[PDB]
Design a protein around this ligand. Structure first.
Ligand SMILES: OCc1cccc(Oc2ccccn2)c1
Length: 209
C-alpha cells in the first residue's frame, strides 16, 4: 500500500533550484543532515527530562554515518524524536513553505545555497548529491513509515516492513553517479571535522569490508 503525494509548488521549486543550479560546494549536505539529527536528538532529550519513559524506545542518543559502496548509498541514522506520518507528509516536520520563501529572497539579496539551513529547509540539500532519498522514521506516538522521492514533483509514503528501528530517523541517500566521493572514509571524516566538530552527540563513521 503506497500513497503518492504532490509536493507543494514552492517545495518543488526549491528542489529543482537545488538540483539545477550550478554550485560546487556540495559537501554542505552532510552538515545540514547532521544538524537536523542533532535537533531531533535535542527534542527527545528535552521530553525525557520530565518523562523518562520517552526513552523506553531506546536510551542511546547518537548519530551513525554508514557508507555502502555496493548500493552506492550514504545513510545518516539518528535516535532522535522521529517523525509521525503527518510530519512526513507535512514536509518532514519543517515549515518548508515559509522557509523556502525566506530562503529565496535571501538568495536574490546576496546569499548562497550553503545558508539553506538557516531557513529550516536544510533537509532538501540532500538533493545536491542524491538522485533519490529514502527517509525511514519512527516516533513514539506512531508506527514506522518510509518516505521516498526522486524529486520530479512527487513523493511516496508507506508503512515500512523493514528492520524495526525503535525510535529515530534514517536518511538514505542514493548518490548520483558522479558523487561517490562522499562514500570514501577520508572524505566523510574531513567534512565532519570541518563542519560538525562541535555537535554534542557521538558521530560514528562506519567502515566497509
Ligand atoms: O569545528 C567546526 C564546527 C563548526 C560549526 C559547528 C561545529 O559543531 C557543532 C556544534 C553544535 C551543533 C552543531 N555543530 C563545529
Amino acid at each position: 500500500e503506497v500513497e503518492t503525494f504532490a509536493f507543494q509548488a514552492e517545495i518543488a521549486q526549491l528542489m529543482s533550484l537545488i538540483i539545477n543550479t550550478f554550485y560546487s560546494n556540495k559537501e554542505i549536505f552532510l552538515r545540514e543532515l547532521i544538524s537536523n539529527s542533532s535537533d531531533a536528538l535535542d527534542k527527545i532529550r528535552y521530553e525525557s527530562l520530565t518523562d523518562p519513559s520517552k526513552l523506553d524506545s531506546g536510551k542511546e542518543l547518537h548519530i551513525n554515518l554508514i557508507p555502502n559502496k555496493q548500493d552506492r548509498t550514504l545513510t545518516i541514522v539518528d535516535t532522535g524524536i522521529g517523525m509521525t506520518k503527518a510530519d512526513l507528509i507535512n514536509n518532514l516536520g519543517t515549515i518548508a513553505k515559509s522557509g523556502t520563501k525566506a530562503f529565496m529572497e535571501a538568495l536574490q539579496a546576496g546569499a548562497d545555497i550553503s545558508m539553506i539551513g538557516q531557513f529550516g529547509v536544510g533537509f532538501y540539500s540532500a538533493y545536491l548529491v542524491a538522485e533519490k532519498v529514502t527517509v525511514i522514521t519512527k516516533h513514539n506516538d506512531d508506527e514506522q513509515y518510509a518516505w521516498e522521492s526522486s524529486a520530479g514533483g512527487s513523493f511516496t509514503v508507506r508503512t515500512d516492513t523493514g528492520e524495526p528501528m525503535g525510535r529515530g530517523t534514517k536518511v538514505i541517500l542514493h548518490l548520483k553517479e558522479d558523487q561517490t566521493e562522499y562514500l570514501e572514509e577520508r572524505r566523510i571524516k574531513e567534512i565532519v571535522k570541518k563542519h560538525s566538530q562541535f555537535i554534542g552527540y557521538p558521530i560514528t563513521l562506519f567502515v566497509e569490508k
